[model samples]
Target: VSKGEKLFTGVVPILVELDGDVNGHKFSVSGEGEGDATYGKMSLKFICTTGKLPVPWPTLKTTLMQCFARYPDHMKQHDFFKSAMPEGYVQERTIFFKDDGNYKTRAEVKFEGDTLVNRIELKGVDFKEDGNILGHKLEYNAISGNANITADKQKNGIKAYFTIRHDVEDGSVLLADHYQQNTPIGDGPVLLPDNHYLSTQSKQSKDPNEKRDHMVLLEFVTAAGIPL
Candidate 1:
């Protein structure tokens, strides 16, 4: 709540528990959002959090890193990119194409026992909600604002592409659920000083115009209880 007038929203808590062990520590990622929120700075943050679109993916290269102790269902797809790997097998292969900005044009595909896994994992450290934050302005249909379940994977001979189809475009919608980091981070307990807390990294977009583009939520819509 900020100022005198209050904004109407569906407050909800969401988390992503990675199916792995980080130095014997349980990796639990949690985030909250106002469902069906109105157009504001907070809404913009949600849209670009996913970093799925080409809106100049931020420099999340300086977050956290780890060794994959166990295999988990990578976030993007429901079933894929997860399988038993040999000891010392390569961990994250989710290559990020460096261009004018960030974009997930291609998701890594690995042929496992029978099916190919997308090899994507959503951890609990430096969480983000990337892509076009505007797209998330749809009514909720039982979905979390932190995770992206927009569409299923459309596979070809040996590759696949993730797409979203907005069928229900009414009512209060979820804002954002994707983000980027520069340093490669795997499933593991983020080792940090007790004085510190897991959080999103600071970054900006390369878009020519402000607003409606990538945002660290860099705006005036202070979602905080300020004026103390």
Candidate 2:
């Protein structure tokens, strides 16, 4: 795939159905359009299956370090130039890329077997425009959910979900800049945070003239691939 060219789309033809139960409550999310992915970068884009796209989430944080195993160039701009100690092992980082700019956090990711576990041990730590704020304390703790991977032989694609405790962050609460119907994000599949959000900005921004600022929705649209 070319650097900026889209290789595959997760939303169009809706390759996977994101459905599950959280705390005895069942919910299913369906998106109309295409989620696009490119080579070398974790950023992506999802356009309405037919019409206009949505707004960008002002308060989003990412752990782009973990993506190096698959997309290494995403880490090129950063000073961290280390690879996983053991090959095939998982690594994670919490990067606050943009804000409204509001909120700050300190986070960590742990694993119980193949599942990736994360906990937002802090929250509401205050944010400033254009700052890589880390180590700040938070008001409350939010847990990052586990991700279980499954492969569909028929489609030749990978499907997975990263579950989190929504009692706090939802579409409505997370998306402060634009008011949309599906704003409240709870215990569901959140975007990649780092690359996924960045891709959306480069492709589907409300303003064409502004330099690309990735959006959060791109994570929902882009598909995932499993290495053999």
Candidate 3:
């Protein structure tokens, strides 16, 4: 029953400590950000790379994401946009590969259903203002800016931590705690005022066009979580 998938997780060493480690491999958060500068940012920034096989599954063909239809737009489309995303759709891309060597089809990503770290992260724009997750006030509670991430590969898969905090002065505090392992982003506007934290500190001010920008939700998938 537990002999199907595989782990292509990168051995990248992330040294971060703040957000809770929810066994999540991928994560998404929304809020404000820079200028005309105000562009419809693509999800590749984090989706393709950071989200790369954060897991160790064998991966199927892009059946879940490889088609040209998923290349660019997939990172931003999730339940957050009021699009009733089905629960069975997966993004662990397997665009091309040969469960080959011996000529066979492998359901790599579907191996051990429950032990799949549940979900590595949620929709890029679905984080809420905090409530349920992990143990204490940990987890992403509607993280304002990008949730900082750190990872360490272990037994089941990768162990990670996501955190964001900017409270050096009064009224200058921020936190995006997320919890609920394997939970995908739910209902929420992708754009908020906090995503653009660096825009307003001392020498800068919020761009007038900031309101038009929303954080991009990147969901990355590959043929086998393998790095080329």
Candidate 4:
């Protein structure tokens, strides 16, 4: 997974699909493989609906990208997607997690100038309740791209130990061979877990009402100048 390690070359197409229920509302998100590059720069045409109401692509993509970028290291291990949070970048995210009820969080990331800062604020939930807003912040040295994360009660909570290299031919991003341990924030029943993960694989529906399986398809293109 080092620089020029051959993760994915040329243009590729990836299709994503997730069908499930959120807060008892049936929802489905399916994406058309119109984007270029499987692991490099790309775009996705996504169609989402919660029962009857359709969701905008920009909103869904923003949220999905945020969730995906949270663990860019793990994703690069599997050659799924590259990290977009390098220096001189900014990503603002509004995340919603729903089970029996809904929980929201606002995350603002600034990776520009001399420092990289990430601030996350939980909304509507209280510390007195089962779920609450634990403090979270991420600071990094912009020059070296080294990061130090703090959240919940841990100091120097998570550390970035690997270097994300770039392709020489196409200038695309690449992952390193070294593996770093992911630090968990805290342990709580109603609170969101410290380690959240996702994959490009299919799984059976856990809900009896939703019997269909969920699937993700990734296609790589070796030929040149072909739009996916």
Candidate 5:
């Protein structure tokens, strides 16, 4: 009886820890950055990247655990945007999106070293909605294998930027939606004067909007080694 009791209670703690670990693999980044400064300030664009699968499951687990333990309930909604994608979407293949001005099908995903890395070529795609065929809608190409990315001290977020060959009209208007940061400009809560933190010598500032930028609830599919 003693040995059986030890076995049961010992495994219970392990199971709880495992459950917490798996809840850390998911994350989201959402915010607005400097838009095309040349296009006048009238046109404002938003940047969003979702469901970034980690290369190694272990790495995914570790990064996610840290993120979740720190930034819970702060992950942006990926399914909301993913639902906008066309049906039967397959990675490394051509996909179509309605050019309704709200969204567009950019690229099919392919994994490299377990992280998403490539977009295959697209051809002969007919984008139609409401029985109207749009001619030569904009097509998003693959992101360069080399994307320079780093961590942001303020937001505790990762920053990655890259350029790719876009299949749009020579003079067509171009916009950055997700994971595309060309005119790199630094903007976030910590950088904003109104949102700056008080000196360590002084107590922290108390602003309702300040806490708005923090991570509230975190849920992960797989994760480990997270620093809270």
Candidate 6:
């Protein structure tokens, strides 16, 4: 029942390497670079891009092996399905705090039944030294691939906000950021950071068909695992 263990419990090891060409600007971190090397090599593990477990688990391993073989240079692409397995995933993200044992923050990801939860908590916090404190609690339903996020901050006072709902089924989403600002910023499914909002309109026959329209946003990149 190794497959079952991996399916329900969701235990898999996957690494995603990032490198690609953006608008004819070939960006990569493959080998020693010249003076014009604007990009650097980066990779992250435990990230899988595939259907939810129990459904796709049987083929997941095979698929992963095949993909790596075909695209030996998996570093030049993005995988939206990449994620740490539910159990023991917390160890992948915990960073060491200060040595003085004065104040610290803890981040963890755990599985509660079918939902995967991620939370950041502040402990023994020194507000004056740390400035405003911010924490996040995020929940994801593995079965439906839906996500719920809450961001909380404590500065002058405690303020919390809910961002949006991501619906992966029909490729749609719900936006609710206006609550905190008292201003409407529109609604619906959209990509993060740069805000590439999706549309519900269907493509017309006259529309041009292009293969290179897809784009991946590099939130941050570093050299040799050190943030640059």
RMSD values, in order shown = 19.6, 16.4, 19.8, 18.3, 22.5, 22.3
Which segments of candidate 3 are over 4 A away from where they belong? Answer: 1-154, 166-170, 177-228
Candidate 6 residue-wise lDDT, 99-216, digit = tens: 2112222334334454333333323322222211111111222111111212111211111122334222344432223112011112321111111111111111111352322112
Local accuracy of candidate 2 as per-residue lDDT tens digits, 60-113:
323111221123334222211111111112222232223423222232322233
Indicate the residue-level lDDT of 167 in model 5.
Answer: 42
The TM-score of predicted model 1 comes to 0.19
lDDT (CA) per prediction: 0.22, 0.25, 0.20, 0.27, 0.21, 0.20
lDDT of the structure predicted as candidate 6: 0.20
Candidate 3 lDDT, 135-192, residue by residue in tens: 1132221222222112212211111123334232234333323211111133322211
Q: Which tens-of-lDDT digit does each residue in 1-228 have in candidate 4?
A: 432112223333344444433333345665534323333233344444344422212112222321122233323332212222222122222233221122233334323332233333322221222221121111111111222221222422222222323222234332322222222222211111232223221111123454333222222212111122
Selected candidate, larger TM-score, 4 vs 5: 4
Q: Candidate 1: lDDT of 75? A: 20
Off by over 4 Å in 6: 1-84, 91-103, 129-228
Model 5 misplacement above 4 A: 1-135, 138-143, 169-228
The alpha-carbon deviation from the true structure for residue 137 of candidate 2, after best TM-score superposition, in angstroms, is 25
Q: List the pairs of residues colliding in candidate 6.
A: 47-82, 47-83, 48-81, 48-82, 48-83, 49-81, 49-82
lDDT of 1 at 132: 25
TM-score of 4: 0.29
Instruction: Give the 10-residue window scoring lowest on summed lDDT in candidate 4.
Output: 135-144
Better of 3 and 6 by TM-score: 6
Residue-by-residue lDDT tens digits, candidate 5, 104-188: 1123322222122212221222223321213333332222122233333353233333232234445453332224111102221
List the candidates' TM-scores in order: 0.19, 0.24, 0.19, 0.29, 0.19, 0.20
Which candidate do you rate higher for TM-score, 1 or 2?
A: 2
Q: Give the best candidate by TM-score.
A: 4
Which residue segments of model 2 deviate by more than 4 Å? 1-57, 61-65, 72-102, 125-228
Ordered from best to worst lDDT, the candidate numbers read 4, 2, 1, 5, 6, 3
lDDT of 4 at 19: 47
